[PDB]
């Protein structure tokens, strides 16, 4: 059981733009404090995919790390631009949220935002006047995903799904016969230059390395940035120690150490199988959307 789930790779910024009032606990997320945009992701069995890759980036972290661009416009308040993509997707929102965010068909981060002192309804399709104690200060993640930087081009990858006629907002072909319809929890991936790519099967492998996002460092725990640590035969502001993998690359001072650095288990470069070929995605996730299959 991992004690450094809140010790985030990259910057660890979990806030959406224009909701700035829990920055002290969300910018960055770390061991202490509560974050309405992040904490829900760590509750048991609520976000299974992200919990198996918890040392990879959240959607919000990926936005603030410039891995994912913000949609244009970035919010929408509740009728036309949103709610097309939002209405094909079936989601439950806890009470007291003013905002909720998702990866859209273009691979950008979109959000739905309620007016001041309004909250999202349980299905996140409407806003209603504040019932309850207090609006939360963050945004609710509507998808189960994780992200990483990638240069791998996917300008040629398009959703391919056997017998599927429509999945979400994407119509894959013309079906003239009658269709069966269902809300399905569907795996998807997003690549450099690709649109959202829905998949029949999610198939992933991790390749481990010794890059900075493969370690977590800590001084009651406090977060420590590993960029302060000098690599072997190189310069750095602080003194560090760690496991053997760390000491294989950075300088290790068992007596004068400020921080310790362990390997972040599960970290590494993630790859996904797309039509038989292994490709490195920007984000991978699950989404509950309308799917239409031929009969």
């Amino acid at each position: 059981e991992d004690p450094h789930l809140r010790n985030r790779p990259g910057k660890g910024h979990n806030y959406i733009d224009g909701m700035t009032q829990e920055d002290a606990t969300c910018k960055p997320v770390t061991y202490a404090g509560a974050c309405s945009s992040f904490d829900v992701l760590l509750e048991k069995g609520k976000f299974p995919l992200f919990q198996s890759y918890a040392h990879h980036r959240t959607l919000l972290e990926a936005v603030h790390d410039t891995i994912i661009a913000k949609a244009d416009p970035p919010s929408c308040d509740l009728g036309n631009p949103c709610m097309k993509e939002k209405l094909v997707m079936k989601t439950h929102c806890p009470n007291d949220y003013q905002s909720a965010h998702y990866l859209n068909n273009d691979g950008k981060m979109a959000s739905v935002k309620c007016p001041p002192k309004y909250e999202l309804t349980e299905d996140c399709n409407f806003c209603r006047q504040m019932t309850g104690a207090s609006l939360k200060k963050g945004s609710y993640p509507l998808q189960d995903l994780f992200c990483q930087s990638s240069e791998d081009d996917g300008s040629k990858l398009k959703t391919k799904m056997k017998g599927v006629c429509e999945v979400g907002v994407q119509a894959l072909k013309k079906c003239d016969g009658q269709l069966s319809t269902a809300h399905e929890v569907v795996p998807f991936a997003v690549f450099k230059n690709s649109k959202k790519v829905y998949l029949d099967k999610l198939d992933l492998k991790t390749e481990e390395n010794l890059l900075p996002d493969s370690f977590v460092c800590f001084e009651e725990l406090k977060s420590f940035d590993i960029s302060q640590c000098p690599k072997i035969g190189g310069h750095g502001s602080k003194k560090c120690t760690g496991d053997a993998a760390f000491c294989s690359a950075y300088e290790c001072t068992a007596q004068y150490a400020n921080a310790y650095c362990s390997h972040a288990n599960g970290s590494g470069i993630v790859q996904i199988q797309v039509s038989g070929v292994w490709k490195k995605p920007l984000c991978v996730g699950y989404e509950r959307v309308v799917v239409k299959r031929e009969l």
């Epitope: 700035t20 009032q21 920055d23 002290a24 910018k27 202490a32 007016p115 001041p116 200060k137």
Partner: antibody
Amino acid sequence: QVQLQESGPGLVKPSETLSLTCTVSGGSISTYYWSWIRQPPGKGLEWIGYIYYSGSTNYNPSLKTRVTISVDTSKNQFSLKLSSVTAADTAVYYCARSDYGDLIFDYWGQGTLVTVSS
Amino acid sequence: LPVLTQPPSVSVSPGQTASITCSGDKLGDKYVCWYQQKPGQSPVLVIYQDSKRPSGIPERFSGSNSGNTATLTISGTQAMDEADYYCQACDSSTVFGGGTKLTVLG
């Protein structure tokens, strides 16, 4: 249970820099917002800025060019610097704590009077 | 930069109902806090989030906010309640009101 205690000189010459320190007791800097607020004799309240443990800040835009707020978690205090000071800066300076960045001030210090005079 | 306007000087006879107003454009979209200050001491939070009361504050204190106007009301005002009252936009772009001195007559 927290107590906030402002300390600093009571006299600052014009154009010089004003400096204050708030010491938190019976509590910690932790994840709260720590704010400086001032009140000119006989006048209303004005918010100067806040800081939180990471060192990130946010200043009143009327004052941002002359304000520095800094934090010292190891000593459980935080500080205000207000530069090129003027007679308009004569005031009681308060430190205050809030839970979130909406700045609901539920704990206040006692206030220090700083007079600007030659 | 925002400005909230209160009246200086509200007057009320004991046991009656004092009402402090605080105005600004679309103030009803922001959450409002109220503070009471008595001679020589620090402000004390009396109302937060337009209408909530901190633990330990007499229930005769209530508040409301709608349109361009927030209101702090004391029912059955005592001599105890002679003080200055400040409203604040305890929301994104924070600002205080100019303050209201409350004199309780008789």
